[PDB]
Design a protein around this motif. Structure first.
Motif, PDB file in Angstrom:
ATOM      1  N   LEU A 137     -66.720 -47.441 -47.160  1.00 55.28           N
ATOM      2  CA  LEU A 137     -65.680 -48.372 -47.580  1.00 55.28           C
ATOM      3  C   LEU A 137     -64.309 -47.774 -47.294  1.00 55.28           C
ATOM      4  CD1 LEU A 137     -67.186 -49.690 -50.933  1.00 55.28           C
ATOM      5  CD2 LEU A 137     -67.437 -50.576 -48.602  1.00 55.28           C
ATOM      6  N   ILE A 138     -63.448 -48.565 -46.659  1.00 54.23           N
ATOM      7  CA  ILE A 138     -62.140 -48.118 -46.188  1.00 54.23           C
ATOM      8  C   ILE A 138     -61.091 -49.032 -46.803  1.00 54.23           C
ATOM      9  CG2 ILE A 138     -60.813 -47.399 -44.178  1.00 54.23           C
ATOM     10  CD1 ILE A 138     -63.454 -47.834 -42.539  1.00 54.23           C
ATOM     11  N   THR A 164     -67.014 -54.458 -40.260  1.00 55.87           N
ATOM     12  CA  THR A 164     -66.268 -55.688 -40.467  1.00 55.87           C
ATOM     13  C   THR A 164     -64.842 -55.554 -39.940  1.00 55.87           C
ATOM     14  OG1 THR A 164     -65.518 -55.052 -42.688  1.00 55.87           O
ATOM     15  CG2 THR A 164     -67.621 -56.206 -42.522  1.00 55.87           C
ATOM     16  N   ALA A 176     -61.610 -52.427 -45.037  1.00 60.14           N
ATOM     17  CA  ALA A 176     -62.697 -52.716 -44.113  1.00 60.14           C
ATOM     18  C   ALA A 176     -63.925 -51.936 -44.560  1.00 60.14           C
ATOM     19  CB  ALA A 176     -62.314 -52.373 -42.672  1.00 60.14           C
ATOM     20  N   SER A 177     -65.051 -52.211 -43.904  1.00 59.13           N
ATOM     21  CA  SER A 177     -66.316 -51.601 -44.285  1.00 59.13           C
ATOM     22  C   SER A 177     -67.171 -51.383 -43.046  1.00 59.13           C
ATOM     23  CB  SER A 177     -67.075 -52.470 -45.300  1.00 59.13           C
ATOM     24  OG  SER A 177     -67.337 -53.763 -44.776  1.00 59.13           O
ATOM     25  N   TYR A 179     -71.391 -50.005 -41.990  1.00 65.25           N
ATOM     26  CA  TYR A 179     -72.732 -49.742 -42.485  1.00 65.25           C
ATOM     27  C   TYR A 179     -73.552 -49.043 -41.413  1.00 65.25           C
ATOM     28  CZ  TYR A 179     -71.525 -53.205 -46.067  1.00 65.25           C
ATOM     29  OH  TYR A 179     -70.914 -53.894 -47.091  1.00 65.25           O
TER      30      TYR A 179
END
Lengths: 212, 231, 208
Positions: A137-138, A164, A176-177, A179
């Motif tokens: 997670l950013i 994302t 942003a994220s 995975y």
């Protein structure tokens, strides 16, 4: 006919920008304006001419001349960064309603912010479900652009990576994220995994390890 | 203080019929207004679909006329939309809105030459696909003693493998809003969506305190309260 | 001393044309100097007769015959138009009110005024004529509207006709203007289900 407007324009923080909407339909009907942010419904900002709904700040003004309607934003603020659609009713036929293509408004000069990175390893409940997802997670960065690279130990890993596009937080910073989907064996067979977040030439890396 | 609210299936098979109902409250549909429908495909602009008067007279987008039907129902204070023979081009967020009266000639006061949609529904996502609905699995994103950031810490929930969009997440039933951010979803190669939701939480009590993320997936009629507890 | 109308005609002054605001109607005059308007196109009935009756007056006065924010609760009174613009902004006559639908209805209208000024009262009003039947419904909602003005010495029923007309000052619609003199103690009654341009201000005067 149709309503045509520039699809993108930029304005410096605190400066003034005029977004233009043109169409022969504007010769007999007033042009309304909407503001839309990602994941939200449009918000009417000009009924027509220069009449604002209640709660719309004074720096949003509307004018027109000929078949051209203009929305002026004086002293652009960070929260003005959004999409702006013009809207009217066609003057021919059964008078269908027509939308402009929209104008994407970039507000330059917002305060820069380095990304804050939080890397979650696979939760034990997910592992007990025979799955291993790494969540990176950013948050709290500007400009709203970022590239993410994942590492297994020291080697690159591109397979299983989903990321994302940044979008605004409630504090006008971007988030942003990313995975990394692994099998339980891929997770525990390596010494560590890393999420590398590059922003404006600088890189923040977070590392997690199965044994820790 | 009229307010609108859409409702209907979030998934429609190709060649099927999309059916949505807009609930009107705080005012009467019997009025001088044009109850309208608007849609927005993914990453595209707004597109007007049609409008209807309480009398039942309709005015449609020419490019959608031969597939669109807009009805009104004064028995429930609702108006609805039907779109037939849907394809992937009809996947979009659908809104119901409210427009004012107008005139066709230059013989009316200025109020009848505006066009706007002042009140809007929150919008409901409709996706056209042959794939089937799937509820989500929710896993905890518990902060480790290393992943803290001083007196504050980031904790969240991972909402895995659901279909179709969307999913919404709150915390402690809405009582906790400390830096809540629900991220946009990602689409895996399996055709299933995944997203995360994060909240900012004090580090003092991370070894004892539990937090609840309230996951909502209307397309499958599932709600999940997942407890995020110390790692 | 004469009445100075500046760049306005009697019609523009008596109707309350927004461009005749600064004009002041003094209490009495012997004649009227003029520069021959009606910003909304239409027919001013017995216009020359009115100019003759207003030629010389004493005890002249402009008064509020039907207050805007009380007399018409169930109707919309804010109607403005670009044909009668003022300061680059749509407006309307200062002595008349364009009544339109409120909340999707135009309830049957009925209002009356008794002349207690102990002088003759000049009342003016209008009848509006859209150019298509759809707009008639939008503005007034009844298709076969009527306007009725009755006093002890005046009685007339106006039927609006819906016809396509050439543009005048960019306007396809029309407003016909009418007037009558009300004797002291007499009552005038306005009735309509649409198309009434209602009196907002009126005038009391002694002729001669």
């Amino acid at each position: 006919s149709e309503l045509t407007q520039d699809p993108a324009v930029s304005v410096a923080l605190g400066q003034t920008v005029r977004i233009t909407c043109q169409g022969d339909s504007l010769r007999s009907y007033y042009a309304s304006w909407y503001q839309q942010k990602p994941g939200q419904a449009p918000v009417l900002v000009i009924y027509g001419k220069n009449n604002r709904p209640s709660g719309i700040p004074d720096r949003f003004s509307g004018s027109s001349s000929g078949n051209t309607a203009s929305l002026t934003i004086t002293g652009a603020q960070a929260e003005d960064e959004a999409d702006y659609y013009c809207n009217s009713r066609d003057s021919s036929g059964n008078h269908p309603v027509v939308f402009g293509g929209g104008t994407k408004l970039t507000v330059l000069g917002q305060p820069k912010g380095a990304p804050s990175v939080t890397l979650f390893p696979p939760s034990s409940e997910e592992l007990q479900a025979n799955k291993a997802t790494l969540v990176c997670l950013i948050s709290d960065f500007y400009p709203g652009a970022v590239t993410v690279a994942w590492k297994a130990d020291s080697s690159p890993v591109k397979a299983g990576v989903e990321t994302t596009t940044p979008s605004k937080q409630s504090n006008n910073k971007y988030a942003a994220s990313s995975y990394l989907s692994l099998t339980p064996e891929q997770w525990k067979s390596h010494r560590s995994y890393s999420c590398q977040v590059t922003h404006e030439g600088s890189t923040v890396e977070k590392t997690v390890a199965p044994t820790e | 203080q009229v307010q609108l609210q859409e409702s209907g299936p979030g998934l429609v098979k190709p060649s099927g019929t999309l059916s949505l109902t807009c609930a009107v409250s705080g005012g009467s549909i019997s009025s001088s207004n044009w109850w309208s429908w608007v849609r927005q495909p993914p990453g595209k602009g707004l597109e007007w679909i049609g409008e209807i008067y309480h009398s039942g007279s309709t005015n449609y987008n020419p490019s959608l006329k031969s597939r669109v039907t807009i009805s009104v129902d004064k028995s429930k204070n609702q108006f609805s939309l039907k779109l037939s023979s849907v394809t992937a081009a009809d996947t979009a967020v659908y809104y119901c809105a409210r427009a004012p009266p107008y005139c066709s000639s230059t013989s009316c006061p200025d109020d009848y030459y505006y066009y706007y949609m002042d009140v809007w529904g929150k919008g409901t996502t409709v996706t056209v696909s042959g794939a089937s609905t799937k509820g989500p699995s929710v896993f905890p994103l518990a902060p480790s003693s290393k992943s803290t950031s001083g007196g504050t810490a980031a904790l969240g929930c991972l909402v895995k493998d659901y279909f179709p969009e969307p999913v919404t997440v709150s915390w402690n039933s809405g009582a906790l809003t400390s830096g809540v951010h629900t991220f946009p979803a990602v689409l895996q190669s399996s055709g299933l969506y995944s997203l995360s939701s994060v909240v900012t939480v004090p580090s003092s009590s991370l070894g004892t305190q539990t937090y609840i993320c309230n996951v909502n997936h209307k397309p499958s009629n599932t709600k999940v309260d997942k407890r995020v507890e110390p790692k | 001393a004469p009445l100075q109308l500046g760049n306005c005609s009697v019609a523009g002054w008596i109707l309350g044309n927004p461009e005749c605001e600064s004009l002041i109607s003094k209490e009495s005059w012997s004649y009227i100097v003029e520069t021959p308007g009606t910003c909304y196109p239409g027919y001013f009935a017995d216009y020359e007769e009115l100019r003759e009756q207003l030629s010389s007056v004493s005890s002249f006065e402009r008064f509020e015959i039907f207050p805007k924010e009380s007399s018409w609760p169930n109707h919309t009174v804010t109607g403005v138009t670009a044909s009668c613009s003022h300061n680059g902004k749509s407006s309307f006559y200062r002595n008349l009110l364009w009544l339109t639908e409120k909340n999707g209805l135009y309830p049957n209208l009925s209002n009356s005024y008794v002349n207690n000024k102990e002088k003759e009262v000049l009342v003016l009003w209008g009848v509006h004529h859209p150019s298509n039947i759809r707009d008639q419904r939008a503005i007034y909602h009844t298709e076969n509207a009527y306007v009725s003005v009755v006093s002890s010495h005046y009685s007339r029923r106006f039927t609006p006709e819906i016809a396509k007309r050439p543009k005048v000052r960019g306007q396809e619609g029309r407003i016909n203007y009418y007037w009558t003199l009300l004797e002291p103690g007499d009552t005038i009654i306005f009735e309509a289900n649409g198309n009434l341009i209602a009196p907002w201000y009126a005038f009391a005067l002694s002729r001669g």
